[PDB]
Motif scaffolding. Sequence first.
Motif, PDB file in Angstrom:
ATOM      1  N   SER A 130      86.827  24.924  31.010  1.00 12.66           N
ATOM      2  CA  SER A 130      86.472  24.279  29.567  1.00 12.66           C
ATOM      3  C   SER A 130      87.205  24.923  27.836  1.00 12.66           C
ATOM      4  CB  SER A 130      85.248  24.625  29.138  1.00 12.66           C
ATOM      5  OG  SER A 130      84.978  24.391  27.087  1.00 12.66           O
ATOM      6  N   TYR A 131      88.521  24.148  27.866  1.00 12.51           N
ATOM      7  CA  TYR A 131      88.993  25.051  26.678  1.00 12.51           C
ATOM      8  C   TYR A 131      88.872  24.973  25.387  1.00 12.51           C
ATOM      9  CZ  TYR A 131      92.311  25.580  30.618  1.00 12.51           C
ATOM     10  OH  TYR A 131      92.757  26.163  32.193  1.00 12.51           O
ATOM     11  N   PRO A 132      88.718  25.714  24.810  1.00 12.08           N
ATOM     12  CA  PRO A 132      88.428  25.649  22.621  1.00 12.08           C
ATOM     13  C   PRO A 132      89.819  24.984  22.149  1.00 12.08           C
ATOM     14  CG  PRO A 132      89.316  28.441  23.348  1.00 12.08           C
ATOM     15  CD  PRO A 132      89.286  27.055  24.633  1.00 12.08           C
ATOM     16  N   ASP A 133      89.733  24.404  21.113  1.00 14.29           N
ATOM     17  CA  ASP A 133      90.854  24.470  20.420  1.00 14.29           C
ATOM     18  C   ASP A 133      91.196  25.025  19.193  1.00 14.29           C
ATOM     19  OD1 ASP A 133      90.917  22.394  21.335  1.00 14.29           O
ATOM     20  OD2 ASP A 133      89.887  20.905  20.246  1.00 14.29           O
ATOM     21  N   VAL A 134      90.294  26.072  18.804  1.00 13.59           N
ATOM     22  CA  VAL A 134      90.683  27.368  17.776  1.00 13.59           C
ATOM     23  C   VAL A 134      90.167  28.752  18.602  1.00 13.59           C
ATOM     24  CG1 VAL A 134      88.602  26.383  16.361  1.00 13.59           C
ATOM     25  CG2 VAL A 134      87.561  28.334  17.464  1.00 13.59           C
ATOM     26  N   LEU A 135      91.039  30.076  18.033  1.00 12.87           N
ATOM     27  CA  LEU A 135      91.204  30.920  19.014  1.00 12.87           C
ATOM     28  C   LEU A 135      89.918  31.859  18.924  1.00 12.87           C
ATOM     29  CD1 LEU A 135      94.312  33.293  19.978  1.00 12.87           C
ATOM     30  CD2 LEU A 135      93.553  34.056  18.125  1.00 12.87           C
ATOM     31  N   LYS A 136      89.792  32.088  20.446  1.00 13.53           N
ATOM     32  CA  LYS A 136      89.005  32.972  20.485  1.00 13.53           C
ATOM     33  C   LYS A 136      89.264  34.522  20.724  1.00 13.53           C
ATOM     34  CE  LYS A 136      85.670  29.769  20.984  1.00 13.53           C
ATOM     35  NZ  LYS A 136      84.630  29.659  20.100  1.00 13.53           N
ATOM     36  N   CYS A 137      88.478  35.433  20.669  1.00  9.17           N
ATOM     37  CA  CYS A 137      88.441  36.910  20.261  1.00  9.17           C
ATOM     38  C   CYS A 137      87.208  37.392  21.236  1.00  9.17           C
ATOM     39  CB  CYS A 137      88.286  37.169  18.911  1.00  9.17           C
ATOM     40  SG  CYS A 137      89.449  37.098  18.233  1.00  9.17           S
ATOM     41  N   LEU A 138      88.126  38.830  21.778  1.00  7.90           N
ATOM     42  CA  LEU A 138      86.799  39.828  22.800  1.00  7.90           C
ATOM     43  C   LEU A 138      87.332  40.901  23.171  1.00  7.90           C
ATOM     44  CD1 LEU A 138      85.235  39.826  24.867  1.00  7.90           C
ATOM     45  CD2 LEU A 138      86.924  39.524  26.825  1.00  7.90           C
ATOM     46  N   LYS A 139      86.011  41.639  22.597  1.00  6.03           N
ATOM     47  CA  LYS A 139      86.502  43.060  22.725  1.00  6.03           C
ATOM     48  C   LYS A 139      85.677  43.892  24.393  1.00  6.03           C
ATOM     49  CE  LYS A 139      87.090  45.266  19.844  1.00  6.03           C
ATOM     50  NZ  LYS A 139      87.046  46.322  18.639  1.00  6.03           N
ATOM     51  N   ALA A 140      87.391  44.647  24.562  1.00  8.32           N
ATOM     52  CA  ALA A 140      87.097  44.980  26.464  1.00  8.32           C
ATOM     53  C   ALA A 140      87.605  46.484  26.085  1.00  8.32           C
ATOM     54  CB  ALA A 140      88.353  44.004  26.944  1.00  8.32           C
ATOM     55  N   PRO A 141      86.836  47.314  26.832  1.00 10.33           N
ATOM     56  CA  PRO A 141      87.785  48.702  26.692  1.00 10.33           C
ATOM     57  C   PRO A 141      88.732  49.184  27.846  1.00 10.33           C
ATOM     58  CG  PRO A 141      84.859  48.347  28.709  1.00 10.33           C
ATOM     59  CD  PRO A 141      85.399  47.435  26.780  1.00 10.33           C
ATOM     60  N   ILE A 142      89.396  50.014  27.569  1.00  7.50           N
ATOM     61  CA  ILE A 142      89.841  50.171  28.663  1.00  7.50           C
ATOM     62  C   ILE A 142      89.020  50.454  29.920  1.00  7.50           C
ATOM     63  CG2 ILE A 142      92.884  51.288  28.889  1.00  7.50           C
ATOM     64  CD1 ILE A 142      93.477  50.680  26.289  1.00  7.50           C
ATOM     65  N   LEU A 143      89.920  50.719  31.233  1.00  5.13           N
ATOM     66  CA  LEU A 143      88.952  51.326  31.980  1.00  5.13           C
ATOM     67  C   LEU A 143      89.176  51.944  32.682  1.00  5.13           C
ATOM     68  CD1 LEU A 143      87.238  48.604  33.857  1.00  5.13           C
ATOM     69  CD2 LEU A 143      86.645  49.636  32.285  1.00  5.13           C
ATOM     70  N   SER A 144      89.418  53.265  33.102  1.00  6.06           N
ATOM     71  CA  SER A 144      90.110  54.630  33.657  1.00  6.06           C
ATOM     72  C   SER A 144      91.287  53.752  35.110  1.00  6.06           C
ATOM     73  CB  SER A 144      89.528  55.467  34.822  1.00  6.06           C
ATOM     74  OG  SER A 144      88.968  54.761  36.063  1.00  6.06           O
ATOM     75  N   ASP A 145      92.115  54.130  35.394  1.00  4.63           N
ATOM     76  CA  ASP A 145      92.972  53.880  35.721  1.00  4.63           C
ATOM     77  C   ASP A 145      92.543  53.467  37.395  1.00  4.63           C
ATOM     78  OD1 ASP A 145      95.387  53.542  34.231  1.00  4.63           O
ATOM     79  OD2 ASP A 145      96.262  55.206  34.716  1.00  4.63           O
ATOM     80  N   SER A 146      92.027  54.531  38.072  1.00  2.00           N
ATOM     81  CA  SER A 146      90.955  54.785  39.126  1.00  2.00           C
ATOM     82  C   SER A 146      90.226  54.148  39.169  1.00  2.00           C
ATOM     83  CB  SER A 146      90.866  56.294  39.533  1.00  2.00           C
ATOM     84  OG  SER A 146      89.555  57.025  40.829  1.00  2.00           O
ATOM     85  N   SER A 147      88.964  53.637  38.247  1.00  6.27           N
ATOM     86  CA  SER A 147      88.510  52.678  38.448  1.00  6.27           C
ATOM     87  C   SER A 147      89.350  51.316  38.656  1.00  6.27           C
ATOM     88  CB  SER A 147      87.514  52.296  37.269  1.00  6.27           C
ATOM     89  OG  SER A 147      86.844  51.522  37.497  1.00  6.27           O
ATOM     90  N   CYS A 148      89.951  50.800  38.113  1.00  7.84           N
ATOM     91  CA  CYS A 148      91.191  49.706  38.582  1.00  7.84           C
ATOM     92  C   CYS A 148      91.907  48.951  39.826  1.00  7.84           C
ATOM     93  CB  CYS A 148      92.152  49.566  37.473  1.00  7.84           C
ATOM     94  SG  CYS A 148      92.245  49.368  35.629  1.00  7.84           S
ATOM     95  N   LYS A 149      91.970  50.484  40.185  1.00  3.61           N
ATOM     96  CA  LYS A 149      92.075  50.986  41.688  1.00  3.61           C
ATOM     97  C   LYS A 149      91.577  50.119  43.102  1.00  3.61           C
ATOM     98  CE  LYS A 149      96.791  53.215  41.252  1.00  3.61           C
ATOM     99  NZ  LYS A 149      97.386  54.296  41.657  1.00  3.61           N
TER     100      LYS A 149
END
Length: 223
Positions: A130-149
Amino acid sequence: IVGGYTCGANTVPYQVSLNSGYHFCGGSLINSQWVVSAAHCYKSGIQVRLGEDNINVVEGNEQFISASKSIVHPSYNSETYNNDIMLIKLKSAASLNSRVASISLPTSCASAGTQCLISGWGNTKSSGTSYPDVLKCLKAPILSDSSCKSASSFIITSNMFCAGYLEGGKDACQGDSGGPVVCSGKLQGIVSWGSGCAQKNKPGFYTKVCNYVSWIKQTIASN
Ligand SMILES: N=C(N)NCCC[C@@H](NS(=O)(=O)Cc1ccccc1)C(=O)NCC(=O)NCc1ccc(C(=N)N)cc1
Ligand SMILES: [Ca+2]
Ligand SMILES: [Cl-]
């Protein structure tokens, strides 16, 4: 954007829509004549759309400007998404105002735990579409490099960071590609890749803009 909220019209004034008959990617305005997006958004026939909220309705604050030049990062690797960054020069200078504004490039990289603002007109669903027509926003934390890997079976380089929620439910998604991750008023990321959207242990990966300030500035200065 999955699990986000409606930004509000022109609250993200550096957000652009890249249009080739239809919205296909986001981007970030960094001065009156230059947009930064993802290399995987590369194609010809790009019109840059600034001042947008509803991308299907002319609401009165838009500027539509053709690209005169696209420059994919010299080292972009389409198999790994390493160096997933691209600059787009506008055919004419955008008129800057409260609803069309550039975003500052970073002076230092951001750290794990900072909550950043990610935005776009991408898919809002983790399963199905489902694609919106108005701009959507999100607050998200940067994760540690180790966690991402620890959470991926794909290549992750020092030119990427991951951000989001390992429990799933909140993430960027297809159509958000090339769009901004802004942290304390600096453009720190570009929506690059991720396995599905908003899935458990499959966080969003982002081009690490702080590694490219030198390249971005020199390229703009000489073009
Ligand atoms: N070599 C690597 N790293 N391989 C793993 C990633 C490949 C690919 N993932 S994918 O196919 O699931 C992307 C996707 C496609 C359709 C619908 C939903 C999601 C992918 O992400 N391709 C590029 C892409 O589609 N980018 C758009 C994008 C933006 C944000 C997310 C996210 N979840 N944060 C995912 C994809
Ligand atoms: Ca519009
Ligand atoms: Cl994976």
